[PDB]
Amino acid sequence: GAEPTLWAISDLHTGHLGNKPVAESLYPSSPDDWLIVAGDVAERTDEIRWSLDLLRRRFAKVIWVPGNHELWTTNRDPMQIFGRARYDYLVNMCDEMGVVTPEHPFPVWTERGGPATIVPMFLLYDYSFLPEGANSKAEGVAIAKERNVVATDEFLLSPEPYPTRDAWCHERVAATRARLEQLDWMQPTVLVNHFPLLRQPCDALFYPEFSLWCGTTKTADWHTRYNAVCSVYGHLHIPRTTWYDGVRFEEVSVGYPREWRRRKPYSWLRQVLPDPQY
Ligand SMILES: [Fe+3]
Numbered sequence: 001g002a003e004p005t006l007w008a009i010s011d012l013h014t015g016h017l018g019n020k021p022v023a024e025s026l027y028p029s030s031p032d033d034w035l036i037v038a039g040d041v042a043e044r045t046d047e048i049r050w051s052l053d054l055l056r057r058r059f060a061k062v063i064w065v066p067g068n069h070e071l072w073t074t075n076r077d078p079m080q081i082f083g084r085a086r087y088d089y090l091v092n093m094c095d096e097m098g099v100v101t102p103e104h105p106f107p108v109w110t111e112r113g114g115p116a117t118i119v120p121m122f123l124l125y126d127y128s129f130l131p132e133g134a135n136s137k138a139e140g141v142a143i144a145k146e147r148n149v150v151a152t153d154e155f156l157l158s159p160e161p162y163p164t165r166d167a168w169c170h171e172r173v174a175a176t177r178a179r180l181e182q183l184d185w186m187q188p189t190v191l192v193n194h195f196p197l198l199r200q201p202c203d204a205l206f207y208p209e210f211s212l213w214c215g216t217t218k219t220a221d222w223h224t225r226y227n228a229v230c231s232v233y234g235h236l237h238i239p240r241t242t243w244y245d246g247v248r249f250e251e252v253s254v255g256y257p258r259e260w261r262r263r264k265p266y267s268w269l270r271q272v273l274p275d276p277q278y
């Protein structure tokens with residue numbers, strides 16, 4: 001009576017007043033629990049480090065993937081680093097703390113839930129989730145701008161040295177797909193990515209245009225192609241459990257204080273493995 005569990009959570013946003021207690025209430029159920037943190041830990045590098053240091057001292061293993069907010073460079077950030085350099089800095093930070101990143105070898109869960117390869121991914125988005133009235137990236141962003149639905153990324157998420165964020169996204173997708181092809185085709189995977197791997201969850205957004213900043217069409221079939229037993233994501237701030245083509249998708253976001261105070265959730269940590277039979 002003390003069997004390990006693989007949990008997940010995302011969108012901690014510890015910099016916002018009121019979400020620091022949430023992060024400070026994250027505890028394991030056994031000394032061998034793993035915790036997936038699926039993006040949007042914080043914006044500033046020191047806040048991200050504080051949160052990840054707090055979590056890695058409680059869980060046996062922490063697997064971190066970046067969200068859009070970790071790649072923001074604000075004026076109040078002690079590290080004025082941008083783009084791929086900022087991502088490499090965050091990866092090196094996590095490595096110095098012992099936190100697993102998308103650049104580390106894929107961890108393998110060998111406890112309850114079967115041998116499952118946990119795949120931490122950094123993919124970003126490529127403006128391919130076009131709104132109904134759009135037929136290109138520029139058209140979609142223009143329609144979103146005229147309706148005042150623009151992501152702050154456009155001004156804070158630098159893609160340097162890449163020219164655009166979709167170029168960075170396509171390179172990330174190419175590399176991650178190359179790594180995914182090298183996996184044993186008969187072993188389940190746990191796909192982790194801040195953004196949803198397919199477009200369907202974005203249909204729950206209050207306004208659809210924002211879907212432009214919510215993923216890429218190049219990963220529409222990865223949950224079935226690579227035999228995923230569970231797909232962990234966040235970003236949308238719509239925490240729930242759904243099923244697509246037999247695969248269980250877990251939106252594990254916490255959100256901003258005024259968002260999750262309207263609800264009363266049963267515990268912050270979402271059980272990824274073993275199957276909770278929900
Ligand atoms: Fe996000």
Ligand SMILES: [Mn+2]
Nearest residue numbers: 011040235237
């Ligand atoms: Mn978020």
